[PDB]
């Protein structure tokens, strides 16, 4: 399906999605036609799903915590309720189900006491409620751009 | 300092960064030269940090897991030991995502294609790490907010 030309195109566009057809041709030493037709195929077959931007600077939250929460058939539904409630809240960047059972959230605020207060009013406050682990993120070694990607507004 | 027009431009670009200035000016009802200037300015200040693509399900990992490691004992040695495990993990295929929590934990996001490749991954690269007090594995069953994370982090 994908050969090395497709993969090289995708790698360049992951670093800088502004790169035009003549630019990729000059960087990849392939004719402009060839590249044009490859890109057009990656887009029609959904391999490139979407073009977006990474936010930097004053729009990445300063303090991040990862939270894993465990609730104690009504169960499918209660996790659905908690997770839509968390999804609607500002500074909640990522929400996922895990097993039956569990919710993973990444939350971010600009003040650490604001992040404590937020946990504490919106998460530790959920009824039935067996366990919660909070993992404040002190540094990111790989995937630093994730915050700028998930960050809203 | 950001105003409503700054935010509105960013929202649309976060939506679809293929949107050109003339399309943004039509959608926002602002002269083209204002949009243009605002975009150059956000790019210069690093508010728009980077333009990227999100990969489609052919290149996304089908099975994702979050891993939480807690080190028992490697204080200057703890810091250095975590760096070592961080760098070892980062160099591995499928590793999305590595972060340090507090002085003693490593958080990783791993994608593979089966259950299975993940089990085999944990056998080989996680339970082989010496001096770990705790290992937790949280399979991602369903992403509710942020589903395009794995298309963003997917390596090719
Ligand atoms: Au916290
Ligand atoms: Au395992």
């Amino acid at each position: 399906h994908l050969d090395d030309l497709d993969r090289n195109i995708l790698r360049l566009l992951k670093k800088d999605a502004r790169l035009t057809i003549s630019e990729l041709s000059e960087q990849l030493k392939k004719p402009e036609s060839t590249i044009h037709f490859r890109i057009k195929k990656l887009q029609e077959r959904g391999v490139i799903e979407r073009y977006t931007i990474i936010l930097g600077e004053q729009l990445k939250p300063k303090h991040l915590a990862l939270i894993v929460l465990e609730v104690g058939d009504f169960l499918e539904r209660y996790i659905s309720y908690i997770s839509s409630t968390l999804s609607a809240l500002p500074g909640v960047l990522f929400v996922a189900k895990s097993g039956e059972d569990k919710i993973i959230a990444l939350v971010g605020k600009n003040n650490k006491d604001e992040l404590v207060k937020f946990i504490e009013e919106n998460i530790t406050s959920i009824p039935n409620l067996k366990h919660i682990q909070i993992f404040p993120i002190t540094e990111i070694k790989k995937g630093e751009d994730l915050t700028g990607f998930l960050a809203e507004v």
Side-chain angles (χ1 to χ4, degrees), chain A residues 1-44 46-153:
Chain A
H1 179 199
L2 310 183
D3 60 42
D4 294 322
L5 180 48
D6 297 323
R7 297 188 144 88
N8 278 352
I9 290 169
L10 304 169
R11 287 185 190 113
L12 292 179
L13 294 179
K14 270 160 73 70
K15 260 138 75 148
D16 205 335
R18 298 165 309 157
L19 281 162
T20 59
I21 281 157
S22 68
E23 292 184 285
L24 302 158
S25 166
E26 89 185 332
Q27 297 185 18
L28 296 161
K29 298 154 209 71
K30 292 281 172 164
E32 288 188 52
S33 57
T34 300
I35 274 143
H36 189 345
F37 308 143
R38 294 311 197 71
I39 287 182
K40 192 128 186 315
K41 217 157 209 338
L42 292 166
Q43 293 177 157
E44 50 201 21
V47 184
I48 301 161
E49 171 183 309
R50 211 173 91 226
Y51 293 67
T52 193
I53 56 162
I54 293 152
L55 306 176
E57 246 223 1
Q58 77 217 250
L59 292 159
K60 294 185 218 291
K62 260 103 243 169
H63 297 91
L64 278 160
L66 183 90
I67 297 153
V68 183
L69 143 192
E70 186 194 326
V71 314
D73 187 5
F74 278 30
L75 180 67
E76 181 237 301
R77 266 179 247 152
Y78 193 56
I79 288 136
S80 203
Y81 157 69
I82 293 167
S83 82
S84 36
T85 298
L86 295 191
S87 296
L89 291 163
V92 175
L93 315 185
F94 178 85
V95 188
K97 189 177 173 184
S98 180
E100 250 149 20
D101 206 28
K102 280 182 270 293
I103 294 178
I104 301 152
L106 183 70
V107 190
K109 297 285 160 167
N110 269 358
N111 184 261
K112 215 182 177 221
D113 271 342
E114 204 185 16
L115 191 51
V116 171
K117 205 135 189 197
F118 175 94
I119 304 181
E120 213 187 40
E121 287 161 4
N122 287 294
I123 297 176
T124 67
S125 79
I126 290 146
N128 316 299
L129 267 56
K130 194 173 197 294
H131 299 134
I132 68 142
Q133 304 187 67
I134 300 152
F135 303 108
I137 292 160
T138 56
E139 62 181 307
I140 297 162
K141 299 257 169 70
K142 193 191 197 167
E144 280 159 21
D145 288 357
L146 162 158
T147 309
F149 170 73
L150 295 175
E152 195 57 49
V153 166

